[PDB]
Amino acid sequence: RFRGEHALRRYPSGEERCIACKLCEAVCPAQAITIEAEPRADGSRRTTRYDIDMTKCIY
Amino acid sequence: DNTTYKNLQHHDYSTYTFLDLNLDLSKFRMPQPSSGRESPR
Amino acid sequence: PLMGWASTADPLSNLVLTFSTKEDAVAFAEKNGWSYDVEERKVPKPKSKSYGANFSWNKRTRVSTK
Amino acid sequence: KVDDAKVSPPKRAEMKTSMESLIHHFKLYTEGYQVPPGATYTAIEAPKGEFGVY
Amino acid sequence: SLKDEDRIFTNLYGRHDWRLKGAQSRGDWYKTKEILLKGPDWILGEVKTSGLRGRGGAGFPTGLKWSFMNKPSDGRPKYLVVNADEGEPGTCKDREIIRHDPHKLVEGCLVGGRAMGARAAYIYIRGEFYNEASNLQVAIREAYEAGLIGKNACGSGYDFDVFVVRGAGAYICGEETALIESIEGKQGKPRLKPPFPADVGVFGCPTTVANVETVAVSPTICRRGGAWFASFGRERNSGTKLFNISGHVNNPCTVEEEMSVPLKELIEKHAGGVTGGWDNLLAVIPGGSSTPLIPKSVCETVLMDFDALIQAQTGLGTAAVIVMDRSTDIVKAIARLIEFYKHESCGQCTPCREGVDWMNKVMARFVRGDARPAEIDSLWEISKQIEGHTICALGDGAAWPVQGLIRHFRPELEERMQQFAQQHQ
Amino acid sequence: VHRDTPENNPETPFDFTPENYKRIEAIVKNYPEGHKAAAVLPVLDLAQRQNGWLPISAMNKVAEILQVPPMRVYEVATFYTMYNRKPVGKYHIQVCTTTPCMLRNSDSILEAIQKKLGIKVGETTPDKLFTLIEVECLGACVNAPMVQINDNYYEDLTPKDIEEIIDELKAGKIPKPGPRSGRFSC
Amino acid sequence: SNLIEVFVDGQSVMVEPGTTVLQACEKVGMQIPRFCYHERLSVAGNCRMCLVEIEKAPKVVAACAMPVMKGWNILTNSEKTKKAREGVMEFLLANHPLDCPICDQGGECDLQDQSMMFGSDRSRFLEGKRAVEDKNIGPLVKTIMTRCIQCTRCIRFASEIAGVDDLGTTGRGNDMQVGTYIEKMFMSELSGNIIDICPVGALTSKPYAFTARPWETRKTESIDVMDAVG
């Protein structure tokens, strides 16, 4: 368990694992992670904008 | 007292026995007081 | 234009102060120098909501289907 | 972690099944703890000196 | 001091032959002209002096309960509600007191008409009873045509007419607010009892809800002597209550036995299954379904009374016997009773609609035995949480018997749990 | 299901009382005009007795005749157990399964009725004559088993006797208040 | 002149006759956790969460139901009142899906704020969880009835104030569905308020859907134009 590089995982059968809760945005102490949420026109609630700037973020 | 169940009248009853008696019980019945309104909702 | 965030030039914007009294908040605004437009506190009105009104006979306030 | 899940975030195997744990996981993030009002002071001995947290 | 065997002078007698003309020959409507002529102070005062306990599955005394619905001055006309629907499974008082002798219940509506000050009387029968409803309506048709109910009732100014209203297969006609709401037109859900009781709002009227067995005692106290119903039984509990012997028995029969009768002699008088309390594993219920199961150690010594049974941690209210055999499973039987409460819970209070329904799913695991030994100790706390915080008393009725699985039992529960866990794993 | 209302023709065909409409007026006459919505339960019971298996439009027509909102009438019908709205049957066989009957052998009567008729547990017969349902309690707990059919229930029935009553029901309806012993005590 | 002196935790407060226990507690500054009660809507004792124990009484009464009479010492922080709130909260969340990430309501949720403060830290729950088939009410209001706690507040809203009469309880026990039985497309005036009436994430705005969480958006007060009342 090591932290250094930000990468978002997905399910074994495709499909983006992230849900756009903005939970990770609120906990973020640097306020680095920016998130805009939208419905994907097919019921599921997922992401549109997802910028985690490395100018900020203290890992 | 006789050793026989005297409830044979209940066996010979059709689908319209409670609804048929209720229409028959219209005579000798006091009118119910309303005093409220024609339509509450 | 750098990315997607909404950046603002205005510095004094992202601050929320706390006050105990309306007279203290007005005095602090005059002390800072900035002009203030005070709004009156909208207190919730006491409405007599009784359970007995739900089962009314003369009144039309009778609740239908629970 | 602290036995009370009202302060310590619940375990990952525990939070994914029961409702109470996931709410506590949702509320210990975004919101803090809701701390009792007042002022505390601690100074645990540093090799350099004192970390006098106020 | 002790309870008399069956009693030769009993309140209920109609079982062999009675229709309409036979009621006058048996001993009904004899002093109806004298009782109606007497004032409300003489009618309600006689009921208060006798001290007749509540025949329904509540335990509340009738003497104080009828006094609230006296009504000195009111705008809305007062009504009388008689809940004749069948209560807890085991209690068969509704099928016997209505189908065999309907005029005994009809006499209570006339006796309680001038006493409570009712303009109109309602007799609420369950939807399952249609053969009983046909007999009840025909007796009401003979009563109205004769000239004893409606306009001029036994030579009195008070005019009260009885009307039969059929339900639709619902257990939620039990509570006083529940039976009132069911006749009101809205869904069968009970109103909040603390702010507006029965005497405050029932079909937009100050009314009083009473059981069919409790309504049958009113002409028995009026026509016959008040001391006759008061002396038989105990000091606190008074009046002959019909206790139906059912369950695992060779000859199941409903008997009109006197109050404060011993349970060992009650099974012997009706002829039980294996034994009165020796051969078969005694787990007999003192009530219909609401009361917790009584152990083999405390059964012969305990008496079936309205007040005395509650002191022995098994409050009998529904007044019915449900005996269990040694061969039959104790855990599987009560789990079906909880499943009965799952189907018959109305769905208002969240500790009942999401409580009892959750209680049944945990209890289903106990039958198969796929539960931890700690789960027995936990379930006792959940049952305590349900009992205190509900609108109606169905939340109580689904909490008492499951507590009876914790008390006196538990070696029966642990042996079912340990053997099934070892076999599967 | 107790919420889903499909459009497989229960919304358009409607049923009305031709001569029983006068009986419905007498049923509304029993309860006072002040809050006249009390007649919603006995009128629906008369509608279900006139025609078994209640459609959506009949509930709307009962609400229109009683001047009540259609949502209040639909919620009342869905709440009670006695009303049949999803399956259709000539004689709905409802057997008791509660503990006062289960301890005195009710599962033996339930297994014998399932084998003889053809129904599994809740599904209706392909001939559309019998519909099996696990009822909570019939009322009369004095008899050890209890089974209800259409209007009258058969008390104290042996596994062979209950099968004989089901076989006879196909040709001629038998009354039978208790085909075992006396009505009062044994 | 029509005033009753009563005690909230032993503190004197003067109230009008006819007022509820919760109304008396609002006067001193106390706020009992609630789900059915609303300032504008009627009174129903459905959820039984607003339980508050008054001394010298065997059973705990709800703040919704009881009107305040003479001489009551309402104890908010007693041993039984805390156990009552912790109990019912476990019942409310036993049959409620793990949907907080996919839920349209975030920090604004009434179940979240109350269960953290008043409810227990951990649940005894092992097996169960009911699932409810969702009904398409309208294009303006998204409806996921799985999350509904059957509180009966929207049903009272549509009947007493909106005056449309479409929502209603159907079934008994766990199997109780809130909504229209006939699958009717519910569209009327004040229908954009039923999303705010519902304390949980059962009723939500379909045009808004998913954009921001309550804590993320900065609130600003304004008078609404294109309306007569303003």
Ligand SMILES: Cc1cc2nc3c(=O)[nH]c(=O)nc-3n(C[C@H](O)[C@H](O)[C@H](O)COP(=O)(O)O)c2cc1C
């Ligand atoms: C689970 C349960 C079921 C009940 N069922 C009935 C019933 O079917 N009929 C009835 O008259 N009373 C029933 N009662 C008793 C009620 O409390 C009733 O409204 C009232 O107290 C009867 O008053 P009485 O005993 O003075 O006649 C039931 C009580 C409980 C707890």
Ligand code: SF4
């Ligand atoms: S928004 Fe953040 S917390 Fe939510 S799923 Fe995506 S990465 Fe995880």
Ligand code: SF4
């Ligand atoms: S205790 Fe259960 S049955 Fe009684 S009112 Fe509450 S939810 Fe309904």
Ligand code: SF4
């Ligand atoms: S209603 Fe509240 S507790 Fe339930 S899933 Fe939504 S946010 Fe979570």
Ligand code: SF4
């Ligand atoms: S949808 Fe919301 S307001 Fe309506 S009953 Fe359910 S929880 Fe209450």
Ligand code: FES
């Ligand atoms: S329990 Fe079977 S008839 Fe009542």
Ligand code: FES
């Ligand atoms: S908020 Fe008072 S009972 Fe639900």
